[PDB]
Amino acid sequence: KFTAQQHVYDINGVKVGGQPGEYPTVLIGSIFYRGHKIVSDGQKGIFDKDAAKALLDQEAELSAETGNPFIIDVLGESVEALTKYVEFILENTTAPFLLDSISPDVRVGALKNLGKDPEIQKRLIYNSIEEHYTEEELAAIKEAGLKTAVILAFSKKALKPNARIDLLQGKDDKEGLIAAAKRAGIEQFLVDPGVLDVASNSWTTEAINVVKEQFGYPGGCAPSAAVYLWKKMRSKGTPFFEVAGAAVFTYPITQGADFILYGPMMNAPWVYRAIATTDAMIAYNNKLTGVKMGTTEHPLLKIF
Amino acid sequence: KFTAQQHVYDINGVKVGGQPGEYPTVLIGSIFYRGHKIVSDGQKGIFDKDAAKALLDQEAELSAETGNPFIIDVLGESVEALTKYVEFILENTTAPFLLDSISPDVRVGALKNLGKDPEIQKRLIYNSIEEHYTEEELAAIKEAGLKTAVILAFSKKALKPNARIDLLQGKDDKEGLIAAAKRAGIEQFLVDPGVLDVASNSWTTEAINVVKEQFGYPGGCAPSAAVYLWKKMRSKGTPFFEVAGAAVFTYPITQGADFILYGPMMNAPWVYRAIATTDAMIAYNNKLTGVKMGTTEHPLLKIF
Numbered sequence: 001k002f003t004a005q006q007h008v009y010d011i012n013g014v015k016v017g018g019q020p021g022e023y024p025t026v027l028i029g030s031i032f033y034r035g036h037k038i039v040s041d042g043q044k045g046i047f048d049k050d051a052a053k054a055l056l057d058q059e060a061e062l063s064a065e066t067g068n069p070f071i072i073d074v075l076g077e078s079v080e081a082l083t084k085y086v087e088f089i090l091e092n093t094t095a096p097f098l099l100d101s102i103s104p105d106v107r108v109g110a111l112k113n114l115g116k117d118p119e120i121q122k123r124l125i126y127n128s129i130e131e132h133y134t135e136e137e138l139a140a141i142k143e144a145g146l147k148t149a150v151i152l153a154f155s156k157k158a159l160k161p162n163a164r165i166d167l168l169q170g171k172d173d174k175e176g177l178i179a180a181a182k183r184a185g186i187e188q189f190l191v192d193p194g195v196l197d198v199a200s201n202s203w204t205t206e207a208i209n210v211v212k213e214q215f216g217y218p219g220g221c222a223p224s225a226a227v228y229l230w231k232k233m234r235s236k237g238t239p240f241f242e243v244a245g246a247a248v249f250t251y252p253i254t255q256g257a258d259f260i261l262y263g264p265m266m267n268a269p270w271v272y273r274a275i276a277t278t279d280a281m282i283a284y285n286n287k288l289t290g291v292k293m294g295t296t297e298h299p300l301l302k303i304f
Numbered sequence: 305k306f307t308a309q310q311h312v313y314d315i316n317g318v319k320v321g322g323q324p325g326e327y328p329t330v331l332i333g334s335i336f337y338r339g340h341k342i343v344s345d346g347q348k349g350i351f352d353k354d355a356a357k358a359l360l361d362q363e364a365e366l367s368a369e370t371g372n373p374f375i376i377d378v379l380g381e382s383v384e385a386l387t388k389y390v391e392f393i394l395e396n397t398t399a400p401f402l403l404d405s406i407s408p409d410v411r412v413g414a415l416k417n418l419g420k421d422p423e424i425q426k427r428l429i430y431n432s433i434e435e436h437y438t439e440e441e442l443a444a445i446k447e448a449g450l451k452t453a454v455i456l457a458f459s460k461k462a463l464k465p466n467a468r469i470d471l472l473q474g475k476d477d478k479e480g481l482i483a484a485a486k487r488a489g490i491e492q493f494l495v496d497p498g499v500l501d502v503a504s505n506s507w508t509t510e511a512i513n514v515v516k517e518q519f520g521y522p523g524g525c526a527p528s529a530a531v532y533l534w535k536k537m538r539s540k541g542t543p544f545f546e547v548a549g550a551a552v553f554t555y556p557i558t559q560g561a562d563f564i565l566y567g568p569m570m571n572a573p574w575v576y577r578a579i580a581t582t583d584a585m586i587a588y589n590n591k592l593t594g595v596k597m598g599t600t601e602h603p604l605l606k607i608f
């Protein structure tokens with residue numbers, strides 16, 4: 001059980017945060033990622049709409065089965081592509097989503113094209129406020145009137161958990177990422193300390209623990225990239241890769257984390273089954289922790 | 305980290321116990337269990353010697369790969385059967401093993417046949433001293449000169465974790481399981497708080513934490529029975545059963561448990577890969593806490 005009064009956000013019907021066993025893990029699957037074969041042109045954002053819809057339908061079915069809510073990680077390599085992807089997601093699901101690109105210029109460009117829209121303000125989560133943030137980026141977020149952002153403390157200048165907290169809360173001549181998000185008018189913070197590699201997922205998880213301990217903001221991480229770059233384990237094939245992935249993805253949840261970016265949506269069928277299992281065992285512990293479930297839509301009441 | 309100095313037992317080279325991150329998880333795979341297709345006659349103990357050797361060789365290979373030591377769970381339905389099984393295990397592996405049966409009479413009978421053999425004293429672990437122990441059971445253990453036993457600290461009159469203090473130390477007019485074990489000459493206690501179902505594995509793990517915090521005995525459990533009775537999940541096939549199994553089997557390790565009875569040995573290939581991943585992440589936390597690994601044969605140094 002965490003020290004701070006926990007912040008539970010209601011993002012267009014998706015509950016995220018709280019004490020462990022209060023609300024199920026929110027699962028965040030990636031679509032239109034680099035090399036996603038349903039995309040025929042990554043620059044123009046041309047993709048198989050039926051294949052994309054099938055992924056979204058599968059996510060909704062798995063969510064209905066386990067009770068784990070979903071937010072879609074919408075990735076784009078161009079302003080043109082990401083704008084079209086967001087328009088498609090708005091129309092073809094009711095779920096909230098991450099506006100996601102490695103390029104800040106692509107994120108800001110996309111946001112400018114969407115303008116001032118209450119639906120965007122309710123459903124779009126900015127991924128992310130990170131170490132390279134600019135005043136133009138914060139201004140673009142404020143102009144869009146966004147209220148929820150992923151705060152990413154991924155940095156090779158902040159390896160240890162307490163260094164990642166310094167990045168988040170500020171230190172010396174740096175305001176920190178939370179303060180930067182507040183100046184952009186963000187009021188809801190999904191804190192992601194980043195995953196440098198598989199073994200350091202324990203440090204990611206310690207940073208999540210400190211955030212929930214001191215600030216009470218929802219904590220999560222994105223270990224998919226680290227797992228896919230694990231050549232020795234990925235070489236073994238199915239089901240060895242999946243069970244190793246399951247061990248990495250569930251580890252933060254066992255230590256009280258709130259959400260997981262689990263990588264490509266094609267992996268949802270096994271990720272949901274593994275994460276639902278961990279959630280069920282944690283919630284069964286509620287009597288010992290002094291916690292009450294916040295919803296009847298929980299794996300513990302669904303998967304057995 | 306646990307207040308009590310942790311007992312680390314050396315069972316014929318297998319280290320079990322310690323502070324989390326000190327020693328890798330000991331994995332305990334079942335052979336000759338009810339329904340095991342390598343057994344043709346469970347009463348006479350007619351079994352596929354080639355298939356059994358292949359399972360033991362596979363266990364040795366996976367152990368060498370990850371650094372997870374192994375103890376064999378040897379199950380029998382008859383005195384004749386279990387005697388032959390143990391003779392074969394003694395000859396065809398170097399690993400310690402659980403003398404295991406649903407029926408205490410089968411365990412007691414097998415012990416009488418195997419006798420006070422110095423190898424038996426070193427490699428045979430009694431599974432188990434439990435609530436309904438008999439004087440003839442303790443006499444058989446003492447006559448065989450056993451030094452290590454699983455203490456099955458489970459009762460439906462001690463569902464709460466804290467109540468394991470009562471089962472082990474005793475309470476009122478009831479002799480504790482530890483005192484009962486010591487009367488039979490046992491000096492090393494592997495504490496298994498028992499698993500009723502998948503969800504209740506969280507209460508099992510809380511019981512493990514109480515035992516390590518206050519007494520420092522190695523703590524583990526057998527979620528295997530609960531997992532293979534989960535028909536809704538097992539019927540889904542690969543890789544859904546394996547990742548669900550991985551979530552259950554790794555959960556106690558994430559809260560500081562020392563050993564896992566993972567059920568049929570045929571599952572070793574995915575169980576070892578999942579457990580090794582959890583051990584690796586936990587041991588990486590040592591770099592922040594100053595806990596020192598007790599061996600270089602650890603998943604953290606092997607699986608990447």
Ligand SMILES: CN1c2c(O)nc(N)nc2NC[C@@H]1CNc1ccc(C(=O)N[C@@H](CCC(=O)O)C(=O)O)cc1
Binds near residue numbers: 337431525532533
């Ligand atoms: C219940 N349990 C247990 C425990 O909880 N704690 C201790 N100390 N010792 C033990 N020993 C026995 C058991 C752990 N071993 C197990 C657990 C489960 C199985 C099992 O589910 N076998 C399957 C058949 C597997 C097959 O089809 O090959 C079955 O349906 O019976 C096989 C062995």
Ligand code: NA
Binds near residue numbers: 055056058
């Ligand atoms: Na999906």
Ligand code: NA
Binds near residue numbers: 322323325328329562
């Ligand atoms: Na250990």
